[PDB]
Amino acid sequence: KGSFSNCTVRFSGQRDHDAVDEFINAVETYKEVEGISDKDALKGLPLLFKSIAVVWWKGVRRDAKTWSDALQLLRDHFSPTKPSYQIYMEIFETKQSYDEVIDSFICKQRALLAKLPEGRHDEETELDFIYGLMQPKYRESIPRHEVKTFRELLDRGRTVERTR
Amino acid sequence: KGSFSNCTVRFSGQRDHDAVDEFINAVETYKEVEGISDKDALKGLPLLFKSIAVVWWKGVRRDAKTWSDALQLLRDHFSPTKPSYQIYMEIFETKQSYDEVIDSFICKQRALLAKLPEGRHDEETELDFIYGLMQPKYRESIPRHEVKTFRELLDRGRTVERTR
Amino acid sequence: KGSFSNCTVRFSGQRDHDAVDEFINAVETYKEVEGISDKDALKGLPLLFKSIAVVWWKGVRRDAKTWSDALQLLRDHFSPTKPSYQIYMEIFETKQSYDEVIDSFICKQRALLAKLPEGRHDEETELDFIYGLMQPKYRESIPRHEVKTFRELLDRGRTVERTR
Amino acid sequence: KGSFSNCTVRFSGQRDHDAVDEFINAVETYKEVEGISDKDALKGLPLLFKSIAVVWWKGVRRDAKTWSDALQLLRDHFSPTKPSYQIYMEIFETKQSYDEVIDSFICKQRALLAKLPEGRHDEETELDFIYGLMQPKYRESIPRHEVKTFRELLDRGRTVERTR
Amino acid sequence: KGSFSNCTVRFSGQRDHDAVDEFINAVETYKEVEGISDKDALKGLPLLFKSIAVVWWKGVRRDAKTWSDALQLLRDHFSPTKPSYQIYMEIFETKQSYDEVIDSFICKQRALLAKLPEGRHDEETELDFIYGLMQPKYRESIPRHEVKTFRELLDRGRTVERTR
């Protein structure tokens, strides 16, 4: 049923991890849903670029041969894959300011913790790294060693938020 | 005939009841009209998120297994389901100001009264809760005990509005 | 061939006669062109609302049963169907200002004269009601009793406009 | 394959020759490409108007019977078909200012010369009417009687432009 | 499956090399992917122009007979194909300013070097022409004669960028 005719999601070259990962996941998901072969998918790839990136594709066209190589090359030229110590310094710089919802803080911190190499941290030390930066509006009620998984922190945060 | 190819309605994370309920009802209605199966509908769900929420979906992907569970989880993480006393204080705070149409006031107050638990109020006390906040431009003509249902209030409000 | 999948024309609740009549005529025309049945058309109606009006449709869903009833209810809740004397006062308030084209004035005045009940006025008194408000730039050349229909007024107005 | 479902090009009523001619040519071209019959094309015409013009179509609906009559009526009510002496005064009013490209000047002047009645001018006097208003940056090099057609003027203008 | 029905990419007449080359490559790629014949593709070409360029197409319609001739004519009337010495003066005018990423500089300089006639320069002198304008933030670490191809320059530039 077609092969990359037209869609809303495009890519520009904004040089950030979130936009690049969102675009790659959306394209990779669309290919699986619509059911397009691997050889037919690479011919339609300049139908998505609209910016500086199409000038980037006019030069590096002869380096790609398969779909996985082109996707890894798009991940390599733009996502700079920052090292570990900048991430560990970026988590401890900004505390949770007053009058901010729990869910935005938790999803931003989880998206920041996903950048580390996989298999290096469990769930328990993951929650222990995040339990040291919350406001005293939430730390007065729920103590440590009672919340065992990463869902129960939000489950008890939404109760104190409604109570005020 | 396809399975969530592309559409105008998307979701961002605006943290409000009206936008979330509108998006969920529009998606739930589109699934019923187009005739898509339940197993095929969950594979196409990241084609709708475009914001902070796609970073939220990159983390909580392994918690969803059926369509109803994913819809209830999207209702739970964003719509905060406010308690009763804040609603009963929010209805009595703002009176109807001068030079405002009847229909906007009635639809906003009905959308505010839908947040209570279902089966707790009849139609008569529902109209009795709304008849105490209207302007004297409308309360001089129509008295109580004459309007029995919730349609006749608008039916007699549109007559006095045309008369001026 | 589908049933209200996606389209550009939507409705918000702007509270005016022109936008409501345009939206209703466009939807009614699209249903006739595409060839959709009456029972299939009502299931897809919340795919068009995008505003306050979808909160209005979450409350008055159980009042509609057929397509004509829903269309008349949408005409009733928003188009206020103003009385006659306000129209007859609105026609005689604004004269035709200098340096304005004939066609805009004629189409606006015809759209204002359509609001009266049908069958109350002929063509001759219709032109007699409009011939008293034009500029002396056009009334110096063409006199009364020479223009018999409503097309010849524009036909002789476009000649004097080109001449200047 | 459908009959005027939805498209980007619409019409508003901007009262100019270029926008009206572009819209009419695009619609006339789309009808020929998609292959739609003449009786099916007139039912879908209010799906394109979005402005004051739809109020204009609610009044003059009963005057159209064929496609050519409706197209000529749309050309008549909006394009005012200016007389000859205003065109001959409009060509000689604005000279070519300094630092402006040749191609924009030539295409604008050709679009202005198309408004005259057809068959009144050859190619030679057409170029003779345009050779009297160019800058001395171009008239120092190429003389008259050497450029015979209307293409060689641009062909020798692009050479002097690159040279500077 | 259709023949140029509607798409996002259009052309205006912006008079620059990048936008024209992007539009031509996107159209040429779409024709190859969708599988449209050469005779059917030329009838649908005024469905893409939306600007001054459609007035340009109303005049030069009778000069095109095949697809390749129309594409070369669109490349000729707008892309001015600048001479060599302006390019060789444009490369050496702007050095790499401080705090700018390597990839943007490399892709812009490659897109500028593509304008020369093909077959005039190898890869080695191509890298030698670009190695004289970089910042001392990168020239302190990597010396000449160690980087042999044009990929290893970026491969060693991304390492020093992460290190800081």
From Swiss-Prot, chains A, B, C, D, E:
Superkingdom of the source species: Eukaryota
CC annotations in GO: extracellular vesicle; membrane; virus-like capsid
The entry's keywords: Membrane, RNA-binding, Transport
Domain-related comment: The protein is evolutionarily related to retrotransposon Gag proteins. It contains structural elements found within viral Gag polyproteins originated from the Ty3/gypsy retrotransposon family and retains the ability to form virion-like capsid structures that can mediate mRNA transfer between cells. Tetrapod and fly Arc protein-coding genes originated independently from distinct lineages of Ty3/gypsy retrotransposons.
Family listed: Belongs to the ARC/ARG3.1 family.
Biological role: Self-assembles into virion-like capsids that encapsulate RNAs and mediate intercellular RNA transfer. Arc2 protein is released from cells in extracellular vesicles that mediate the transfer of mRNA into neighboring cells.
Subunit-structure text: Homooligomer; homooligomerizes into virion-like capsids.
Protein name: Activity-regulated cytoskeleton associated protein 2
Species in which this protein is naturally found: Drosophila melanogaster
Phylogenetic classification of the source organism: Eukaryota, Metazoa, Ecdysozoa, Arthropoda, Hexapoda
Residues included from the entire protein: 29 to 192 of 193
